[PDB]
Amino acid sequence: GESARSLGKGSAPPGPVPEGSIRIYSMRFCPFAERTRLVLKAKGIRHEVININLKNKPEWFFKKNPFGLVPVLENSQGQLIYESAITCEYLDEAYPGKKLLPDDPYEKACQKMILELFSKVPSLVGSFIRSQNKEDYAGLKEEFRKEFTKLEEVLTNKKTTFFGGNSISMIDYLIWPWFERLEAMKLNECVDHTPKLKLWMAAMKEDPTVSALLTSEKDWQGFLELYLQNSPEACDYGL
Amino acid sequence: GESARSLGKGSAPPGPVPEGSIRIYSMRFCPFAERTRLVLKAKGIRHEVININLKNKPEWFFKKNPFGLVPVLENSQGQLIYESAITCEYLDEAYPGKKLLPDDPYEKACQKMILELFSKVPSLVGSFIRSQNKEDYAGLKEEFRKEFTKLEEVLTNKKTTFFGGNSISMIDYLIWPWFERLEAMKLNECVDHTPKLKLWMAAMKEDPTVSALLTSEKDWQGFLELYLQNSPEACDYGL
Ligand SMILES: *CC(=O)N(CCCNC(=O)C(F)(F)F)c1ccc([N+](=O)[O-])cc1
Ligand SMILES: *CC(=O)N(CCCNC(=O)C(F)(F)F)c1ccc([N+](=O)[O-])cc1
């Protein structure tokens, strides 16, 4: 378990990524990097994980990503890919297995249009912790409602189990991490006027890849309390 | 020339797109939609243009794009694609001709990483007209400097004529429209500590596709003055 402890300030930069593997620089509670990890798991890609201490970053980490953000992929050839959506798509193209994005140009364009429908949700999750009372919480539940009703329409129009069709695909993995945190953020009743989106959540937790990666509510709260204090230990909560 | 006049509020929705063509809903001074038009021209795609009056939109236009934004593509099958970058990539995949994005997953990922380096520039252009004096203009030239130095690094690292290699490609077309407006916005000296980016601009204006689409500074100022008054005529400046 200790093997997953994060690298921070003072740590030695890492050696090369071995042939036959790809490396992901990540952080165990980071929903942006969960995306890439979902994709790695669904496609069966052999990989290694380096958790980055995002409150106490290694200086050499900016050599990996000048923005200082996880996730970052690094392969045996020494190529560096960052930005979550870009990492996920790189993996879908570069590796064999289940294709998560469709081949059809239009179908693929739809998945991205849907991604765009969702694009306000991550910064609402952010600003969810600018909320300090029952009033700001009310308003916030509303902002989440207006965005979830956009996704509800897509499911209503298509009448498919998942956003990309009847099978799970990239779009679902790209959005899942923020819905995973909804329960523990006390926002699960924002889906009660979106009955298909609510059924989508339940189908997601049944996906073997989702399920293998889900963080318990308990673990997530531990992380959150420490995150909100700029604690250098947040990243390693539980160890 | 009158053929290019915009459709506004009151206009009849359009008929179907004919077979052998794709339609772009656009606006002649919209840099987001210029992207899609650059791509249409570079790939030699037969198409028709409907200019949308963005200060006085047709109601039926929201049926084309629930966000109400140009550009939107509509094909003969009746499929609808919006968001500029998504339109451009759809076109690159769906149509024959010069491939604007590379086949290599990593090379393609780089183009998108560069796109991401540029992603603050469009809203700086926006906020460029929140500038009302020589002080806010000073600060603004600085904000533009910090972003252009990021692109300068990419050119320094690669030592290529264009951002995607020695040939012009998608990334260049995706960023060009905001650099096109820089002169007329009185920001051309923001490139004077980025000598490669400045040489990139000159090479761009030599590209036959760029050149066929460039709006004169004169035409652009006409548009801007009317835009800044919420004039329903802005869109059709010159006719
Ligand atoms: C890694 C990652 O995705 N982020 C985005 C965090 C968005 N907010 C949250 O997840 C919430 F408040 F916890 F709900 C990220 C960026 C930086 C850190 N950090 O510990 O400094 C964590 C997560
Ligand atoms: C169509 C398009 O790209 N936009 C973005 C405008 C960004 N600002 C500018 O170009 C500048 F101020 F002119 F420099 C867009 C959106 C809406 C309209 N409109 O006329 O309402 C025009 C352009």
Numbering used by the authors:
A (entry chain A), B (entry chain A): 3 to 241
How does the study describe this entry?
The Omega class GSTs are distinct from the other GST classes because of their active site cysteine residue and their capacity to catalyse several redox reactions that are not catalysed by most other GST isoenzymes. GSTO1-1 catalyses the deglutathionylation of protein thiols and could therefore play a significant role in modulating the glutathionylation of intracellular proteins that participate in specific signaling pathways. Thus, in the models of inflammation that we have investigated, we have consistently observed a phenotype similar to that of TLR4 deficient or MyD88 deficient mice, strongly confirming the view that GSTO1-1 makes a significant contribution to pro-inflammatory signaling via the TLR4 pathway. Overall these studies indicate that GSTO1-1 plays a pro-inflammatory role in the innate immune system and our identification of the mechanism of action of a small molecule inhibitor and demonstration of its capacity to ameliorate LPS mediated inflammatory shock in mice validates GSTO1-1 as a new target and paves the way for the further development of novel anti-inflammatory drugs.
To examine the mechanism underlying the inhibition by ML175 we solved the crystal structure of GSTO1-1 in complex with ML175. The overall structure of the GSTO1-1 - ML175 complex is essentially the same as the previously published complex with GSH1. Superposing the structures results in a RMSD of 0.36 Å over 237 Cα atoms. ML175 binds in the “H-site” of GSTO1-1 and is covalently attached to catalytic residue Cys32. The chloride atom of ML175 has been displaced by the sulfur atom of C32. Clear electron density was observed for the nitrophenyl moiety, with weaker density observed for the propyltrifluoroacetamide group. The flexible nature of the propyltrifluoroacetamide group may explain this observation. The nitrophenyl moiety is oriented toward the side-chain of Lys57, and sits between Leu56 and Tyr229. The propyltrifluoroacetamide moiety lies in an extended conformation oriented toward the back of the “H-site”, contacting residues Pro33, Val127, Ile131 and Trp222. Binding of ML175 induced rotation of residues Tyr229 and Ile131.
